[PDB]
Each structure stands twice: as C-alpha cells, then as structure tokens.
C-alpha cells in the first residue's frame, strides 16, 4: 500500500518525536528504520561506550515498535543507496527523519533526499533535537550569534514547544512487502561483540527510552533543587547524567524542558527555583553550541579564530600519551582521565580542568584531546565536545581573555577534601588531601604514582610567551 518510513538516527525513542509524530498524522502504516552506517561505525573516533549505549537504545526501540503495531527495520551499509532502494522496493509514500546539525549528517541527508526525489518519493526533514531550530534564533540583522549573552536573551524569550504524541495503533508490513525488501535487511540487531566492540564500564544512565524518562523524572523530583551549587563538585552526584540520553535521543528535548518547568512551578523555595533555572540554562547552552556548529561548520575543523589557527603547538607526543593514560602526576587530572576511560563519562568541571591542562600546560593541539574525548565519551557530541575544546583556548565561539587554569586551585576549589581524587585514584587513598590537591606528593608516599610530567609554573610561562610572541608577530 502506502507506507511511510521513519528514519531514526539520534532520536532513538517513540515518545515526543517531532518527525515521527508528523509521520503518524499522515499514515498508520508507519515503519521505523535504522541504518548501521559504516562511515560512522568504523570511524577511529567511535567510542565503545557509545556503541554499547546505542545498541541498548535500539534493542528497546525494536520492542516499542513491536508494541506499537509495526516494526523497526535494520539496515547495514551506505544510507544514500540503501534508504532510497528500501523506500522504492516498498513504494513508500514518504521517508521522514529529524534534521542533523553536523556536517556529515547534513551532507548525507541532502544526498538521501535528492535520491528520494529522483525516485519520486517524498522526503520530510523536521527539527526535533532542539527546542529552537538554528533558523529561529537570529539577531536583529538576521544573523547567527557567536556570543552567548545575546543568544541567551533571545532564546529565553522564545515561547517553548511542548511534547508531541507517541504514535499508536500502527500497521505492520505484510509478507509480500517483507519479501520485496528481504535483501536489504539484517535478520537481527547485531550484538556489541558481533560488531567488534566490548564495553563493561557501565553508563551514567542505563540505555533506552524507559531508563531515560525515569532518570529525568527522578532528577526533577529532587536532585534538581540542589543543582546550584551541587553541580560544581565532581565528588557530588549533582548532575542529571542524561547527556548520552540527549545525544542519542533516548529522551526528547521538550520532555526535559517540561519536566524542569513543572518542577519550577511546583517548587515554593527560592533556592530550588534558582537551581532549576540554572539547569534549564544548561539546555540553552547546549543549543548555543549546536546552533554554532550549524551556522559555522568550519568550527569542526579546529581552532576558529585566526590567531589560534597559527598558534605554535609544541605537540610532544609523550606528554599527550601520559595525559590519555592518566599518568600526568597531577591528581585532579589523572582521577578525571581515569573516570573517562573507565566509565565513559566525566564530570563537566573535570572536563574543563583536563582540557585546560592539555592545552595550557602540555601545550598540545587541542584537537588531539577533542578526538580522545570522542573516542571515549558515551555522550561524545561534536557540537558540545568541539565547543568544550574551543573553549579551552578561546579559539572559537564566545571568546574570553587569555587565562590558564592551575590544577591546584581548581582541585582545592571544587574537590577541597579530595574525595573525587581518592575515589578514582584509590592507590593514593593514604595520601593527605592537602598533598593530592597541591600535587606535591613525597616519593615514598607516592608509590607507583608518577611524578608531575611538567612543571606547571614553567609550562604557564611558556604558553603565555608563545601567545604574546604570536600576538605581536601579527
């Protein structure tokens, strides 16, 4: 008959899904689909933790479609070839999907749409992962924002969209239709091992739409009230842990905003009100970087600002390796890198500390770090990750005066009792918090823990010297 295909990519859920809801209003014969794209899966920048989470979200999505009335088709190969072929073999009335903000996804999408148009099949691309699309937030001159302040002021004033309906009572494909597409389908969802990956480090929130919705609700029911200032301490479990759920769409952005907004209205405490407004602004910050990547795709290439594209990075491989292996000798840094490689997630305050360290202290092209994070983060996200690293050098959007973190100051300020440090560096649980914070540990009391790979003071003078020299040379 006239079935509609909904192509899932980073919206692995059936609830509050813009493109999916629009598709259901056009037809009950709604068949979901996911394509295992080799250019994504085989990339050297793919994190095992991310594939594990992804695979887990898909397992649940297969069930949701089954329960809804149809199914989730699985494909493996090139999208602009396989999607059009599948839609054609199925004489699809249309193929729906939610828009991407990333260069690769957008280029791929334009190609799939063109292939569909050629085949005479409708392609509908709608915005779903953002409360406000990049085209809705523009300045008085109709231009994008590269400074957060003005962006937030506009974004905040825009009326917020509400969650859309979950599609129900779907019509499954028939045997004859299934025969027509048989050659293009995988018989079953490959396991993590079959795909060639292994992960046993756990997750910030268990995989799947259900677990994501439960976490959102548990967070907004309590912990969110203390977000500010509990968000600043790595030792405290004061954040939501929903990052991978938002990256893969296990949770809808409108459900998240609504749950927080409802918690704000329910709250009668001023401090709780503030804490919730602060969390909400985190979501605004997320959109700033996503819109930035959309408007200025070259950001993905590396240092944006002209001065930084010329910065003389030292790039001592040995220093980088030590960083990736948590053998820097700086407790607060090694504890964080251990949390990342071991659990696939890192507290935001720690991401800032280790990024600054790699760029300011080790003086390594931050792209090596951006890539290492992408190779390990369960929430590895180009817009946010690139935004985070451009930040470590003010080389991109919303630049700030040159500054260099002192691991010791940060450690003392956000892990004053060294609880987080001892937690991830148990072999140093005997050392005094004072020494773990300052980074000055006596050889005997240090055991196998390495000594500082660099002298902060000297590295700091070196970085500024290179900055001022290039600053003048221009």
Ligand X SMILES: Cc1cc2nc3c(=O)[nH]c(=O)nc-3n(C[C@H](O)[C@H](O)[C@H](O)COP(=O)(O)OP(=O)(O)OC[C@H]3O[C@@H](n4cnc5c(N)ncnc54)[C@H](O)[C@@H]3O)c2cc1C
Q: Where in the sequence numbering do the catalytic residues fall?
A: 282, 285, 313, 348, 366, 389
Does position 240 bind ligand X by CB under 6 A? Answer: yes
Does position 225 bind ligand X by CB under 6 A? Answer: no
Alpha carbon distance 178, 231 (integer Å): 50
| CB neighbourhood size of 471 (10 A) | 11
Of 247 and 456, the one with the shorter C-beta distance to ligand X is 247
End-to-end CA distance of the chain: 66
Min CB(350)–ligand X separation in Å: 8
Sole binder of ligand X in the list 20, 87, 242, 431 (CB under 6 A)? 242
Does position 379 bind ligand X by CB under 6 A? Answer: yes
Alpha carbon distance 327, 116 (integer Å): 51
Binding segment for ligand X (CB under 6 A), chosen from 38-46, 149-157, 242-250, 267-275, is 242-250
Does position 289 bind ligand X by CB under 6 A? Answer: yes
Alpha carbon distance 83, 75 (integer Å): 9
Binding segment for ligand X (CB under 6 A), chosen from 32-40, 71-79, 136-144, 243-251, is 243-251
Does position 358 bind ligand X by CB under 6 A? Answer: no
Does position 331 bind ligand X by CB under 6 A? Answer: no
Alpha-carbon distances, residue 86 vs 80, 135, 457 (angstroms): 10, 31, 61
Helix, strand, coil proportions of the chain in percent (round to 5)?
55, 5, 40
Q: 185 with 74: CB under 8 angstroms?
A: yes
Alpha carbon distance 351, 389 (integer Å): 9
Of 161 and 241, the one with the shorter C-beta distance to ligand X is 241
Sole binder of ligand X in the list 47, 250, 299, 352 (CB under 6 A)? 352
Q: 109 with 211: CB under 8 angstroms?
A: no
Binding segment for ligand X (CB under 6 A), chosen from 76-84, 189-197, 296-304, 381-389, is 381-389
Does position 397 bind ligand X by CB under 6 A? Answer: no
Count of residues that bind ligand X according to CB under 6 A = 28
Min CB(273)–ligand X separation in Å: 17
Q: 330 with 439: CB under 8 angstroms?
A: yes
Of 365 and 381, the one with the shorter C-beta distance to ligand X is 381
Sole binder of ligand X in the list 100, 361, 381, 398 (CB under 6 A)? 381
Min CB(354)–ligand X separation in Å: 7
Q: Site mask, ligand X, residues 82-121, x = CB under 6 A?
A: ----------------------------------------
Sole binder of ligand X in the list 206, 226, 236, 282 (CB under 6 A)? 282
Of 78 and 206, the one with the shorter C-beta distance to ligand X is 206
Q: What is the DSSP letter of 379?
A: T
Sole binder of ligand X in the list 33, 251, 377, 441 (CB under 6 A)? 377
Alpha-carbon distances, residue 51 vs 19, 25, 99, 220, 251 (angstroms): 24, 32, 21, 28, 17
Does position 388 bind ligand X by CB under 6 A? Answer: yes
Min CB(70)–ligand X separation in Å: 30
Alpha carbon distance 333, 410 (integer Å): 10
Of 297 and 450, the one with the shorter C-beta distance to ligand X is 297
Does position 243 bind ligand X by CB under 6 A? Answer: yes
Binding segment for ligand X (CB under 6 A), chosen from 54-62, 291-299, 349-357, 439-447, is 349-357
Q: Which residues pair with 5 in a beta bridge?
A: 31, 95
Alpha carbon distance 90, 177 (integer Å): 6
356: left (phi over 0), alpha (psi -120 to 50) or beta: alpha
Cα angle at 345 between 341 and 347, to 5 degrees? 120
Does position 373 bind ligand X by CB under 6 A? Answer: yes
Min CB(254)–ligand X separation in Å: 14
Give φ, ψ of 7 to 5 degrees. -95, 110
Alpha-carbon distances, residue 20 vs 27, 66, 97, 111, 136 (angstroms): 11, 15, 7, 21, 21
Tokens of 347: 């507290």
Dihedral sign of CA atoms 402, 407, 412, 413 in order? positive
Binding segment for ligand X (CB under 6 A), chosen from 84-92, 193-201, 207-215, 280-288, is 280-288
Does position 252 bind ligand X by CB under 6 A? Answer: no
Residues within the interface to ligand X (CB under 6 A): 231, 239-243, 246-247, 282-283, 285-286, 289, 348, 351-352, 355, 373, 377, 379-381, 384-385, 387-389, 391
């Amino acid at each position: 008959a006239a079935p509609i295909l909904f192509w899932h990519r980073r919206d692995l859920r059936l609830s509050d899904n813009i493109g999916l809801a629009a598709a259901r209003a056009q037809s009950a014969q709604l068949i979901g689909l996911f394509c295992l794209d080799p250019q994504i899966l085989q990339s050297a920048d793919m994190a095992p933790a991310r594939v594990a989470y992804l695979q887990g979200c898909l397992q649940e999505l297969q069930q949701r479609y089954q329960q809804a009335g149809s199914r989730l088709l699985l494909l493996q190969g090139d999208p602009q070839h396989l999607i059009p072929q599948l839609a054609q073999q199925l004489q699809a009335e249309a193929v729906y999907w939610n828009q991407d903000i990333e260069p690769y996804g957008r280029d791929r999408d334009g190609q799939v749409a063109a292939a569909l148009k050629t085949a005479g099949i409708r392609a509908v691309q709608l915005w779903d992962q953002l409360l406000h699309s990049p085209d809705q937030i523009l300045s008085g001159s109709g231009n994008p924002y590269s400074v957060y302040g003005p962006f937030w002021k506009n974004w905040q004033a825009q009326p917020k969209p509400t969650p859309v309906a979950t599609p129900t009572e779907l019509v499954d494909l028939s045997p004859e239709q299934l025969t027509a597409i048989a050659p293009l389908l995988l018989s079953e969802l490959p396991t993590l091992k079959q795909l060639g990956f292994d992960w046993d480090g756990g997750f910030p929130v268990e995989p799947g739409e259900t677990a994501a919705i439960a976490r959102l609700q548990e967070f907004c029911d309590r912990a969110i009230a203390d977000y500010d200032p509990q968000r600043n301490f790595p030792a405290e479990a004061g954040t939501s842990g929903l990052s991978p759920a938002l990256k893969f769409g296990a949770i809808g952005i409108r459900q998240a905003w609504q749950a927080a907004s409802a918690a704000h209205a329910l709250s009668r405490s001023d401090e709780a009100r503030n804490s919730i407004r602060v969390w909400q602004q985190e979501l605004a910050w997320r959109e700033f970087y996503q819109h930035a990547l959309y408007h200025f795709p070259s950001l993905a290439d590396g240092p944006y600002r002209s001065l930084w594209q010329q910065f003389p990075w030292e790039n001592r491989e040995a220093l980088f390796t030590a960083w990736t292996q948590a053998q820097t000798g700086y407790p607060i840094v090694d504890a964080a890198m251990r949390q990342l490689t071991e659990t696939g997630w890192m507290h935001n305050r720690c991401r800032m500390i280790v990024a600054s360290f790699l760029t300011k202290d080790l003086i390594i092209d931050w792209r090596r770090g951006e890539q290492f994070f992408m190779q390990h983060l369960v929430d590895g996200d180009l817009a946010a990750n690139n935004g985070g690293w451009q930040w470590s050098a003010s080389s991109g959007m919303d630049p700030k005066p040159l500054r260099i973190f002192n691991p010791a100051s940060q450690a003392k300020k956000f892990d004053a009792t060294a609880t987080y440090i001892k937690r991830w560096l148990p072999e140093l649980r005997h050392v005094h918090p004072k020494d773990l914070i300052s980074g000055e540990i006596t050889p005997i009391e240090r055991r196998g823990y390495p000594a500082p790979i660099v002298n902060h003071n000297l590295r700091q003078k070196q970085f500024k010297a290179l900055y001022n020299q290039l600053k003048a040379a221009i």
